């Protein structure tokens, strides 16, 4: 009664461009996290094996053991930079400033989260202030929501009239990454992969597809 169609399956030598996501010259600030659609390709993770000294890799809602057998309509790669001690928040069901105000994974999340330390790239001894996160918001984010407003936050009771000051903060904090910090305050690059299967022909398959051609 339904169908299963291979009309949009990929050429088996056409590997998903994961490496290009991972060796980007610069990553996004987490408040303005960046998303990349991956499709019409084979999701062979050998292309980023040992690409960096990875810190964490965990999947949610799908088992990594089954991944190479699986097919998807799309993969979404979100990438940003956060503090060492905030990585635990890039997972379902977390709270804290990153999970509440910057990047919120849903409870039914299906995908994986890869993180690595990038001190030697993202921290000047002068201090790299280019990386920011959102410290203040009136409310928590919805799953996969993005917020890039630079409206002055009214902490207290008196309106701020768009001018910062006592109880009126700019809502973005910088990390000021300097190489001498504790790992908790060092920069970690993060990539979140979303695996999507709508009711349509798939366009991404794991490398197990490759065996049929022998």
């Amino acid at each position: 009664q339904p169908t299963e169609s291979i009309v949009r399956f990929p050429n088996i030598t056409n590997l998903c461009p994961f490496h290009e996501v991972f060796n980007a010259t610069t990553f996004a600030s987490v408040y303005a996290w960046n998303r990349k659609r991956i499709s019409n390709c084979v999701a062979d993770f050998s292309v980023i094996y040992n690409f960096a000294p990875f810190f964490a890799f965990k999947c949610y809602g799908v088992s990594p053991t089954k991944l190479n057998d699986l097919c998807w309509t799309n993969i979404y790669a979100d990438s940003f930079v956060i503090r060492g001690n905030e990585v635990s928040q890039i997972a379902p069901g977390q709270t804290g400033n990153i999970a509440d105000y910057n990047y919120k994974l849903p409870d039914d999340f299906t995908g994986c989260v890869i993180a690595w330390n990038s001190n030697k790239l993202d921290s000047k001894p002068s201090g790299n202030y280019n990386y920011l996160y959102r410290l203040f918001r009136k409310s928590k984010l919805k799953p996969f929501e993005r917020d890039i407003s630079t409206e002055i936050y009214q902490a207290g009771n008196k309106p701020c009239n768009g001018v910062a000051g006592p109880n009126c903060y700019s809502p973005l904090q910088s990390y000021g990454f300097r190489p001498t910090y504790g790992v908790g305050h060092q920069p970690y690059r993060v990539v979140v992969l979303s695996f999507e299967l709508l009711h349509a022909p798939a366009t991404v398959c794991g490398p197990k597809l490759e065996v049929l051609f022998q």
Partner: antibody
Amino acid sequence: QVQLQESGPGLVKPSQTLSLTCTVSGDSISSDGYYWSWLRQRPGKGLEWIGYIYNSGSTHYNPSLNSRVSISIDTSKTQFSLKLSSVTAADTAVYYCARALVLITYVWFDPWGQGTLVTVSS
Amino acid sequence: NFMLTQPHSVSESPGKTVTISCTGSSGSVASNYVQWYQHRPGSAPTTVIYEDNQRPSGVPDRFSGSIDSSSNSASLTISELKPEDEADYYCQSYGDRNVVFGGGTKLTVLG
């Protein structure tokens, strides 16, 4: 099911090169997500990873052995082999081959060979 | 670098439950998947747990793996213990660009 079988010389003179081979049956080596791995267990010690290879030809080996290790795949795609140079008595061990499922930091060894004992002795 | 540490031996009586922990240093064991291998002298090592807590087909539900980030440990737990459960058990994971094995624990079924 895939089945792994080591084979190689029982005895190796100190400072020469250990060569082993794994024969893979019920399956073949290809760019399908699986890596092909050597490990070992020295006497009284525990399991110790050596290195593995993907059909792309990329290798990764244990840092404490990396200089001396070299793994390769036979063009028949039913064997891979281990070479370990300048062995000493400390390389006496049971050497195992295994299939490895490898994604980022997730490596799961399964199944394993039965191991072949290699003795370094004059 | 990232190391996993297991006690050298554990023992328990048949039918009871025994736990084998695997404790990290220079790293967070909850950050990367942990496997458990059973190794009977003279035999291929086999898998009792992969992906922290998954059981291959054929491994009885008496085996179960758990992770505890608060004490930075991983645990294999064996219930309804049998004399055939005697083996060395190894935890394994990854960290600092290297496959990492715990030193192994010998399990002894007493009584």
